[PDB]
Amino acid sequence: PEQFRIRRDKRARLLAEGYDPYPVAIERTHTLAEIRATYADLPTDSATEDIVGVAGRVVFARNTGKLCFATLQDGDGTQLQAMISLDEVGRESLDRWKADVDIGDVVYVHGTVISSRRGELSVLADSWRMAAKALRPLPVAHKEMSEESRVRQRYVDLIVRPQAREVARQRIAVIRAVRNALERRGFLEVETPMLQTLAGGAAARPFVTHSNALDIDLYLRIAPELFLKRCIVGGFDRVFELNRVFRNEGSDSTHSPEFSMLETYQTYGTYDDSALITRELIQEVADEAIGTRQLSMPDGSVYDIDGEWATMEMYSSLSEALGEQITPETTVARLRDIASGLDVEIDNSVFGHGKLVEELWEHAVGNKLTAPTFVKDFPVETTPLTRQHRSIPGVTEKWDLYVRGVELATGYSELNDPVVQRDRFADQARAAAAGDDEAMQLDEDFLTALEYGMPPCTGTGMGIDRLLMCLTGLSIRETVLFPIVR
Ligand SMILES: N[C@@H](CCCC[NH3+])C(=O)O
């Protein structure tokens, strides 16, 4: 509060003296990266006659008697030296540089591109001008900022930490690579509503808001699934949506209340066809955005996502890990007895054959996975929107993709039978009567869409934040520019 006061008085002083501290219409001829690219092969002590007008943030400054030096940093992080010389700008201008410019200020420097005696690419200024007065100083080093401080002040983090910039450009590139992978395969991107009168498509608690236009309660979407399927009925052959979803989770990590989600739907394909596309897409995104399929991790290890990935069935692989065959006909009592013998804590809310089989598979198989693995053929009780298997009874055609031990993507053979889909919702109602506040409510308008006939299709889902976690090992609080904070 004392450092801020000195800079505030300096700003007020400049404004009164006529020196605009936040001027408008400053013309910048080059970005600092353009200056470094053009004169990269410039001799050590040479000097050009090229006039440039550059602007950047002063991050280092050192003043001598007649000659002042300053390191300007552009937004991307490119640095360039500015030389304010007594012979070049005059005494009155040089004195203002020492009195007015502090670390963090944005300044405009107009002069000639030279290379200092030490071979530093510099701008020999003939004029300088304040572009944005900084009332608060920059941190001394990015190591001094905690992680919660980077989240609360991402704007400061992007200035002082080069990796903060890299991750930001990385997310933009990964999302860009996901779209290119889907457009190469003929998928079109549509927009489905985010405010919905009934929020279906997933098992999650929704955010509720009141609409004054409609005088009813609206729900933030938990998934675009039910509206993307209406697009399939309408005639979209290959469709996807890469945008935000909202899930009202409570005191649970790895999942944020708001995250970006990719859902794709493709007609006349099964969950086998979407599993192949999902693997090729992830591997293509790694090539385009990361540059390798040998993913470097923060702990120094290297993770391999190349090649073909293993596939296993849930009931079959769970039976191998337990030594006892588990089938859809296995009783809930038998599953609870196996869990008690393994010292596994069934989370009170978990009940039923399907949820218990999934919890046992996660403990006995899922958590021990390291390489990318597909697990397919799920219990029918826990996959209401998934078509039943061709031959195997009691299971549905769904796969979950595990990369580095984390659930990354999921794919269905979509249930298009409207009579069976209504039966699944009746089973969801009975689960809701038992205490499951995440069960899916019956969406009548969605069933009406299926009753006009939906072609067979396969649908996928994958969180972008989860994808960034697999490719870079960084949590959602690092790959999102402004994560939510109290
Ligand atoms: N709606 C699913 C995504 C996959 C949909 C497959 N038909 C979810 O939220 O997990």
Coordinates of C-alpha atoms and ligand atoms in Angstrom, one line a residue:
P1 CA 0.0 0.0 0.0
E2 CA 3.0 2.3 0.2
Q3 CA 4.6 1.1 -3.1
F4 CA 1.3 1.7 -4.8
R5 CA 1.1 5.3 -3.5
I6 CA 4.4 6.3 -5.1
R7 CA 3.2 5.1 -8.5
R8 CA -0.2 6.6 -8.1
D9 CA 1.3 10.1 -7.4
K10 CA 3.5 9.6 -10.5
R11 CA 0.5 8.8 -12.7
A12 CA -1.4 11.9 -11.3
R13 CA 1.7 14.0 -11.9
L14 CA 2.0 13.0 -15.5
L15 CA -1.6 13.6 -16.2
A16 CA -1.4 17.1 -14.8
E17 CA 1.8 18.0 -16.6
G18 CA 0.2 17.1 -20.0
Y19 CA 2.1 13.8 -20.4
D20 CA -0.7 11.3 -21.1
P21 CA 0.1 8.2 -19.0
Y22 CA -2.6 6.2 -20.9
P23 CA -2.6 7.6 -24.4
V24 CA -4.6 6.5 -27.4
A25 CA -3.6 6.1 -31.0
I26 CA -0.1 4.9 -30.4
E27 CA 1.1 3.4 -33.7
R28 CA 3.3 0.3 -33.4
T29 CA 5.2 -0.6 -36.6
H30 CA 6.5 -4.0 -35.5
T31 CA 6.0 -6.6 -32.8
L32 CA 9.1 -7.5 -30.9
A33 CA 9.0 -10.9 -32.4
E34 CA 9.1 -9.3 -35.9
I35 CA 12.1 -7.3 -34.9
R36 CA 14.0 -10.4 -33.6
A37 CA 13.1 -12.3 -36.8
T38 CA 14.1 -9.6 -39.3
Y39 CA 17.5 -8.8 -37.7
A40 CA 18.3 -12.3 -36.3
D41 CA 21.5 -12.4 -38.5
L42 CA 22.7 -8.9 -37.7
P43 CA 26.4 -8.3 -36.9
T44 CA 27.5 -7.6 -33.3
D45 CA 28.3 -3.9 -33.4
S46 CA 26.4 -3.0 -36.6
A47 CA 23.7 -0.4 -36.9
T48 CA 21.0 -0.1 -39.5
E49 CA 19.1 3.0 -40.7
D50 CA 15.6 1.4 -40.3
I51 CA 13.1 3.3 -38.3
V52 CA 10.7 1.3 -36.1
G53 CA 8.1 2.1 -33.5
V54 CA 8.0 -0.7 -30.9
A55 CA 6.1 -1.1 -27.6
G56 CA 6.5 -3.4 -24.7
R57 CA 6.6 -3.8 -20.9
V58 CA 9.7 -2.7 -19.0
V59 CA 10.9 -5.7 -17.1
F60 CA 14.5 -4.6 -16.4
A61 CA 16.2 -1.2 -16.4
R62 CA 19.6 0.2 -15.5
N63 CA 20.5 3.9 -15.6
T64 CA 23.9 5.5 -16.0
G65 CA 24.8 9.2 -16.3
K66 CA 24.1 9.8 -20.0
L67 CA 22.8 6.4 -21.2
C68 CA 19.8 4.4 -20.0
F69 CA 19.0 0.8 -20.9
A70 CA 15.7 -1.1 -20.6
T71 CA 14.5 -4.6 -21.5
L72 CA 11.1 -4.4 -23.1
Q73 CA 8.9 -7.5 -23.1
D74 CA 6.1 -8.0 -25.5
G75 CA 2.9 -9.9 -24.8
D76 CA 4.2 -13.1 -26.2
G77 CA 7.3 -12.8 -24.2
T78 CA 9.8 -11.7 -26.8
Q79 CA 12.4 -9.3 -25.3
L80 CA 14.3 -6.4 -26.9
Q81 CA 16.6 -3.8 -25.5
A82 CA 15.8 -0.1 -25.6
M83 CA 18.6 2.5 -25.4
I84 CA 17.7 6.0 -24.2
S85 CA 20.8 8.0 -25.0
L86 CA 21.5 11.6 -24.0
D87 CA 22.8 12.4 -27.4
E88 CA 19.7 10.9 -29.1
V89 CA 16.8 12.2 -27.0
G90 CA 18.2 15.2 -25.2
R91 CA 18.6 15.9 -21.5
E92 CA 15.0 16.8 -20.8
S93 CA 13.7 13.5 -22.3
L94 CA 16.3 11.5 -20.5
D95 CA 15.5 13.0 -17.2
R96 CA 11.8 12.0 -17.7
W97 CA 12.8 8.4 -18.4
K98 CA 14.6 8.2 -15.0
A99 CA 11.7 9.9 -13.1
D100 CA 8.6 8.5 -14.9
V101 CA 9.4 4.9 -16.0
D102 CA 9.1 2.1 -13.4
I103 CA 9.3 -1.7 -13.8
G104 CA 6.0 -3.0 -15.3
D105 CA 5.2 0.1 -17.2
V106 CA 4.3 -0.2 -20.9
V107 CA 6.3 2.2 -23.0
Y108 CA 6.6 3.0 -26.7
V109 CA 10.1 3.4 -28.1
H110 CA 10.7 5.0 -31.6
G111 CA 14.2 4.8 -33.1
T112 CA 16.7 2.9 -35.1
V113 CA 17.4 -0.8 -34.9
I114 CA 21.0 -1.3 -33.8
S115 CA 23.1 -4.0 -32.1
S116 CA 24.9 -2.9 -28.9
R117 CA 28.6 -3.2 -28.3
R118 CA 27.7 -6.4 -26.4
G119 CA 25.8 -7.7 -29.4
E120 CA 22.4 -7.2 -27.9
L121 CA 19.7 -6.4 -30.5
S122 CA 18.4 -3.0 -29.4
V123 CA 16.4 0.1 -30.5
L124 CA 18.5 3.3 -30.3
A125 CA 15.7 5.6 -29.3
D126 CA 15.1 9.1 -30.6
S127 CA 11.8 9.4 -28.8
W128 CA 10.0 7.5 -26.0
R129 CA 6.5 7.7 -24.7
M130 CA 4.5 6.2 -21.8
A131 CA 1.9 3.8 -23.2
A132 CA 0.4 2.4 -19.9
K133 CA 1.5 3.4 -16.4
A134 CA 1.6 0.4 -14.1
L135 CA 0.3 1.2 -10.6
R136 CA 1.4 -2.1 -9.2
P137 CA 4.9 -3.7 -9.6
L138 CA 5.5 -7.0 -11.1
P139 CA 6.6 -9.9 -8.9
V140 CA 10.3 -10.4 -8.5
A141 CA 10.2 -13.9 -9.7
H142 CA 7.3 -16.2 -10.7
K143 CA 8.5 -18.7 -8.0
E144 CA 7.2 -16.2 -5.4
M145 CA 3.6 -16.6 -6.6
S146 CA 1.6 -19.5 -5.1
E147 CA -0.6 -21.6 -7.4
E148 CA -3.7 -20.1 -5.9
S149 CA -2.2 -16.7 -6.7
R150 CA -1.7 -17.7 -10.3
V151 CA -5.3 -18.7 -10.5
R152 CA -6.6 -15.6 -8.8
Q153 CA -4.4 -13.4 -11.0
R154 CA -3.7 -15.2 -14.3
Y155 CA -2.9 -11.8 -16.0
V156 CA 0.1 -11.4 -13.7
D157 CA 1.1 -15.1 -14.2
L158 CA 1.2 -14.8 -18.0
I159 CA 3.6 -11.9 -17.7
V160 CA 6.2 -13.3 -15.3
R161 CA 6.0 -17.1 -16.0
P162 CA 7.0 -18.3 -19.5
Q163 CA 5.4 -21.7 -18.9
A164 CA 2.1 -20.0 -18.1
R165 CA 2.1 -18.6 -21.6
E166 CA 3.1 -22.0 -23.2
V167 CA 0.3 -23.9 -21.5
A168 CA -2.2 -21.2 -22.7
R169 CA -1.0 -21.5 -26.3
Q170 CA -1.0 -25.3 -25.8
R171 CA -4.7 -25.4 -24.9
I172 CA -5.6 -23.3 -27.9
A173 CA -3.6 -25.6 -30.1
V174 CA -5.1 -28.8 -28.7
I175 CA -8.7 -27.6 -29.2
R176 CA -7.7 -26.5 -32.7
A177 CA -6.3 -29.9 -33.4
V178 CA -9.4 -31.7 -32.2
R179 CA -11.5 -29.7 -34.7
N180 CA -9.2 -30.4 -37.6
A181 CA -9.3 -34.2 -36.7
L182 CA -13.1 -34.1 -36.8
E183 CA -13.4 -32.0 -40.0
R184 CA -11.0 -34.3 -41.8
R185 CA -13.6 -37.0 -41.1
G186 CA -16.7 -35.0 -42.2
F187 CA -18.0 -33.9 -38.9
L188 CA -20.0 -30.6 -38.7
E189 CA -20.1 -28.4 -35.6
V190 CA -23.5 -27.3 -34.4
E191 CA -24.7 -25.2 -31.4
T192 CA -27.3 -26.8 -29.1
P193 CA -28.8 -24.8 -26.2
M194 CA -27.1 -24.4 -22.9
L195 CA -30.1 -23.3 -21.0
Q196 CA -32.6 -26.2 -21.0
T197 CA -36.0 -26.8 -19.5
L198 CA -34.9 -30.3 -18.6
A199 CA -31.2 -31.2 -18.3
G200 CA -30.5 -34.7 -19.5
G201 CA -27.8 -36.6 -21.3
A202 CA -25.7 -37.5 -18.2
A203 CA -25.9 -38.5 -14.5
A204 CA -25.1 -35.2 -12.7
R205 CA -26.7 -32.6 -10.5
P206 CA -27.5 -29.5 -12.6
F207 CA -27.3 -25.8 -11.9
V208 CA -30.8 -24.2 -11.6
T209 CA -31.6 -20.6 -12.6
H210 CA -34.8 -18.6 -12.9
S211 CA -35.9 -17.1 -16.2
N212 CA -38.0 -13.9 -16.2
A213 CA -38.8 -14.3 -19.9
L214 CA -40.5 -17.7 -19.4
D215 CA -41.4 -17.5 -15.7
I216 CA -40.0 -21.0 -15.0
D217 CA -36.8 -22.6 -13.8
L218 CA -34.2 -23.3 -16.4
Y219 CA -31.2 -25.7 -16.1
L220 CA -27.7 -25.3 -17.4
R221 CA -26.9 -28.2 -19.6
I222 CA -25.0 -31.1 -18.1
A223 CA -24.5 -32.6 -21.6
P224 CA -25.5 -31.9 -25.2
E225 CA -26.3 -35.6 -25.9
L226 CA -30.1 -35.4 -26.1
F227 CA -30.0 -32.4 -28.5
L228 CA -27.2 -33.8 -30.6
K229 CA -29.3 -37.0 -31.1
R230 CA -32.2 -34.7 -32.3
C231 CA -29.8 -33.5 -34.9
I232 CA -29.2 -37.1 -35.9
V233 CA -32.9 -37.6 -36.3
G234 CA -33.0 -34.3 -38.3
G235 CA -30.5 -35.5 -40.8
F236 CA -27.0 -34.6 -39.6
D237 CA -24.9 -37.5 -40.6
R238 CA -21.7 -36.7 -38.7
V239 CA -22.1 -34.0 -36.0
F240 CA -20.2 -32.7 -33.0
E241 CA -20.2 -29.9 -30.5
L242 CA -17.1 -28.7 -28.6
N243 CA -18.3 -26.3 -25.9
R244 CA -19.1 -25.8 -22.2
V245 CA -21.1 -28.0 -19.9
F246 CA -22.1 -27.4 -16.3
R247 CA -22.3 -29.9 -13.5
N248 CA -23.1 -28.9 -9.9
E249 CA -20.6 -31.0 -8.1
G250 CA -19.9 -30.5 -4.4
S251 CA -16.5 -30.8 -2.7
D252 CA -15.1 -33.2 -5.3
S253 CA -11.8 -32.8 -7.1
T254 CA -10.6 -33.6 -10.6
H255 CA -14.0 -32.4 -11.8
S256 CA -14.7 -28.7 -12.1
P257 CA -18.3 -27.3 -12.1
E258 CA -17.7 -25.8 -15.6
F259 CA -15.6 -27.5 -18.3
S260 CA -15.3 -27.8 -22.0
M261 CA -16.7 -31.1 -23.5
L262 CA -16.5 -32.7 -26.9
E263 CA -19.4 -34.9 -28.1
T264 CA -19.5 -36.5 -31.5
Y265 CA -22.3 -38.5 -33.2
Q266 CA -21.8 -40.5 -36.4
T267 CA -24.6 -42.5 -38.2
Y268 CA -24.2 -46.1 -39.2
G269 CA -21.3 -46.8 -36.9
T270 CA -21.0 -48.8 -33.7
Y271 CA -18.9 -48.3 -30.6
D272 CA -16.2 -50.3 -32.4
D273 CA -16.0 -47.6 -35.1
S274 CA -15.9 -44.7 -32.6
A275 CA -13.2 -46.4 -30.5
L276 CA -11.0 -46.4 -33.6
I277 CA -11.7 -42.8 -34.4
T278 CA -11.2 -41.6 -30.9
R279 CA -7.7 -43.3 -30.7
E280 CA -6.7 -41.9 -34.1
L281 CA -8.0 -38.4 -33.1
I282 CA -6.0 -38.4 -29.8
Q283 CA -2.9 -39.6 -31.5
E284 CA -3.4 -37.0 -34.3
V285 CA -3.9 -34.2 -31.7
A286 CA -0.7 -35.3 -30.0
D287 CA 1.2 -35.0 -33.3
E288 CA -0.3 -31.6 -34.2
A289 CA -0.4 -29.8 -30.8
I290 CA 2.3 -31.5 -28.7
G291 CA 4.6 -32.6 -31.4
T292 CA 5.2 -36.2 -30.3
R293 CA 3.4 -39.3 -29.1
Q294 CA 6.2 -39.7 -26.5
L295 CA 4.5 -37.3 -24.0
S296 CA 6.9 -35.6 -21.5
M297 CA 5.4 -35.4 -18.0
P298 CA 6.2 -32.9 -15.2
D299 CA 7.8 -35.7 -13.1
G300 CA 10.3 -36.3 -16.0
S301 CA 8.8 -39.5 -17.3
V302 CA 7.8 -40.1 -20.9
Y303 CA 4.4 -41.6 -21.6
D304 CA 3.8 -43.6 -24.8
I305 CA 0.3 -43.2 -26.5
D306 CA 1.5 -44.5 -29.9
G307 CA 0.3 -47.7 -31.6
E308 CA -2.8 -49.7 -31.0
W309 CA -4.4 -49.8 -27.5
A310 CA -5.5 -52.8 -25.5
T311 CA -9.2 -53.7 -25.2
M312 CA -10.9 -55.7 -22.5
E313 CA -14.4 -56.5 -21.4
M314 CA -15.5 -55.4 -17.9
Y315 CA -17.1 -58.6 -16.7
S316 CA -14.4 -60.8 -18.3
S317 CA -11.4 -58.8 -17.0
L318 CA -13.0 -58.3 -13.6
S319 CA -13.4 -62.1 -13.4
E320 CA -9.7 -62.7 -14.2
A321 CA -8.6 -60.2 -11.5
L322 CA -10.8 -61.8 -8.9
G323 CA -10.4 -65.5 -9.8
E324 CA -14.2 -65.8 -9.7
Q325 CA -16.4 -65.5 -12.7
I326 CA -18.7 -62.4 -12.4
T327 CA -21.8 -62.4 -14.6
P328 CA -24.8 -60.0 -15.0
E329 CA -26.7 -62.6 -12.9
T330 CA -24.3 -62.2 -9.9
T331 CA -26.3 -61.2 -6.9
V332 CA -25.8 -57.9 -5.1
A333 CA -25.1 -59.8 -1.9
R334 CA -22.3 -61.7 -3.6
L335 CA -20.8 -58.5 -5.0
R336 CA -20.9 -56.9 -1.5
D337 CA -19.2 -60.0 0.0
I338 CA -16.3 -59.8 -2.5
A339 CA -15.9 -56.1 -1.7
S340 CA -15.8 -56.8 2.0
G341 CA -13.1 -59.4 1.4
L342 CA -11.0 -57.0 -0.6
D343 CA -11.3 -54.2 2.0
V344 CA -13.1 -52.0 -0.5
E345 CA -15.3 -49.2 0.8
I346 CA -18.7 -49.1 -1.0
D347 CA -19.6 -45.4 -0.8
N348 CA -23.0 -45.9 0.9
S349 CA -24.7 -44.2 -2.1
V350 CA -23.4 -47.0 -4.3
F351 CA -26.0 -49.7 -4.7
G352 CA -27.3 -52.2 -7.3
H353 CA -25.7 -54.7 -9.5
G354 CA -24.3 -52.3 -12.1
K355 CA -22.7 -49.8 -9.8
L356 CA -21.1 -52.5 -7.7
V357 CA -19.7 -54.3 -10.7
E358 CA -18.2 -50.9 -11.9
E359 CA -16.7 -50.1 -8.5
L360 CA -15.2 -53.6 -8.2
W361 CA -13.7 -53.3 -11.7
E362 CA -12.2 -49.9 -11.0
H363 CA -10.6 -51.2 -7.8
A364 CA -9.3 -54.5 -9.2
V365 CA -8.5 -53.5 -12.8
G366 CA -9.0 -49.8 -13.6
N367 CA -6.8 -48.3 -11.0
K368 CA -3.9 -50.6 -11.9
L369 CA -3.9 -49.7 -15.6
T370 CA -1.0 -47.7 -17.0
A371 CA -1.1 -47.9 -20.8
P372 CA -4.1 -46.6 -22.8
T373 CA -6.9 -49.2 -22.5
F374 CA -10.5 -49.6 -23.6
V375 CA -13.0 -51.3 -21.4
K376 CA -16.2 -52.3 -23.1
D377 CA -19.6 -53.9 -22.5
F378 CA -21.0 -52.3 -19.4
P379 CA -23.9 -53.3 -17.2
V380 CA -27.3 -52.2 -18.5
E381 CA -28.3 -50.7 -15.1
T382 CA -25.7 -47.9 -15.4
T383 CA -26.0 -47.1 -19.2
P384 CA -29.5 -45.9 -19.8
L385 CA -28.8 -44.3 -23.2
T386 CA -26.6 -47.1 -24.5
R387 CA -27.9 -49.9 -26.8
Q388 CA -27.9 -53.4 -25.6
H389 CA -25.2 -55.8 -26.9
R390 CA -25.8 -57.7 -30.1
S391 CA -25.4 -61.1 -28.5
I392 CA -24.3 -60.9 -24.8
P393 CA -27.3 -60.4 -22.5
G394 CA -27.4 -57.9 -19.7
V395 CA -24.7 -55.6 -21.1
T396 CA -24.6 -52.6 -23.4
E397 CA -22.3 -51.5 -26.2
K398 CA -20.3 -48.9 -24.3
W399 CA -16.5 -48.4 -23.9
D400 CA -14.5 -46.2 -21.5
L401 CA -11.0 -45.1 -22.5
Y402 CA -8.4 -45.0 -19.7
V403 CA -5.2 -43.1 -20.5
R404 CA -2.5 -42.9 -17.8
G405 CA -5.0 -44.3 -15.3
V406 CA -7.6 -41.6 -15.9
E407 CA -11.0 -42.0 -17.5
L408 CA -10.7 -39.9 -20.7
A409 CA -13.3 -40.7 -23.2
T410 CA -16.5 -42.8 -23.6
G411 CA -18.4 -44.1 -26.6
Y412 CA -21.8 -45.8 -27.2
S413 CA -23.7 -47.7 -29.7
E414 CA -26.6 -45.3 -29.4
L415 CA -30.0 -46.6 -28.2
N416 CA -32.5 -45.6 -30.9
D417 CA -35.3 -47.9 -30.0
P418 CA -37.9 -45.5 -28.5
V419 CA -39.8 -48.2 -26.6
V420 CA -36.6 -49.6 -25.0
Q421 CA -35.4 -46.1 -24.2
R422 CA -38.6 -45.4 -22.3
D423 CA -38.0 -48.6 -20.3
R424 CA -34.5 -47.4 -19.4
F425 CA -36.0 -44.1 -18.0
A426 CA -38.5 -46.2 -16.0
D427 CA -35.5 -48.0 -14.4
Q428 CA -33.9 -44.6 -13.8
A429 CA -37.1 -43.5 -12.0
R430 CA -36.9 -46.6 -9.7
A431 CA -33.2 -45.7 -9.0
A432 CA -34.3 -42.2 -8.2
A433 CA -36.9 -43.5 -5.7
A434 CA -34.0 -45.4 -3.9
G435 CA -32.1 -42.2 -3.2
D436 CA -30.1 -41.5 -6.5
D437 CA -30.3 -37.8 -6.9
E438 CA -28.2 -38.1 -10.1
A439 CA -30.6 -40.4 -12.0
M440 CA -31.9 -39.3 -15.4
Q441 CA -35.4 -37.8 -15.5
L442 CA -37.7 -38.9 -18.3
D443 CA -37.4 -36.4 -21.1
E444 CA -40.7 -36.8 -23.1
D445 CA -39.7 -34.5 -26.0
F446 CA -36.5 -36.6 -26.5
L447 CA -38.5 -39.8 -26.6
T448 CA -40.8 -38.1 -29.2
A449 CA -37.8 -37.5 -31.3
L450 CA -36.8 -41.1 -31.2
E451 CA -40.4 -42.1 -32.1
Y452 CA -39.9 -40.4 -35.5
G453 CA -37.0 -42.9 -36.1
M454 CA -33.4 -42.3 -35.3
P455 CA -30.8 -44.0 -37.6
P456 CA -28.3 -46.2 -35.9
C457 CA -25.3 -44.2 -34.8
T458 CA -22.4 -44.1 -32.4
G459 CA -21.6 -41.2 -30.0
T460 CA -18.5 -40.2 -28.1
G461 CA -17.7 -37.9 -25.2
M462 CA -14.4 -36.5 -24.0
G463 CA -13.5 -33.6 -21.7
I464 CA -10.8 -31.3 -23.2
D465 CA -9.4 -30.7 -19.7
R466 CA -9.1 -34.4 -19.3
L467 CA -7.4 -34.6 -22.7
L468 CA -4.9 -31.9 -21.7
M469 CA -4.3 -33.8 -18.5
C470 CA -3.3 -36.9 -20.5
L471 CA -1.1 -35.1 -23.0
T472 CA 0.7 -32.7 -20.6
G473 CA 0.1 -34.0 -17.0
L474 CA -1.3 -30.7 -15.9
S475 CA -4.4 -30.3 -13.8
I476 CA -7.5 -28.4 -14.8
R477 CA -6.3 -25.5 -12.6
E478 CA -3.3 -25.0 -14.9
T479 CA -4.8 -25.5 -18.4
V480 CA -7.8 -23.2 -17.9
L481 CA -7.1 -19.4 -18.0
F482 CA -9.5 -18.4 -15.2
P483 CA -10.5 -21.3 -13.1
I484 CA -13.2 -20.7 -10.5
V485 CA -12.2 -19.5 -7.1
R486 CA -14.0 -18.3 -3.9
Ligands
LIG1 N1 -23.2 -37.6 -22.6 C1 -22.0 -38.4 -22.3 C2 -21.0 -38.3 -23.4 C3 -21.0 -39.5 -24.3 C4 -22.3 -39.7 -25.1 C5 -22.3 -40.9 -25.9 N2 -23.6 -41.1 -26.6 C6 -21.4 -37.9 -21.0 O1 -21.8 -36.8 -20.5 O2 -20.6 -38.5 -20.4

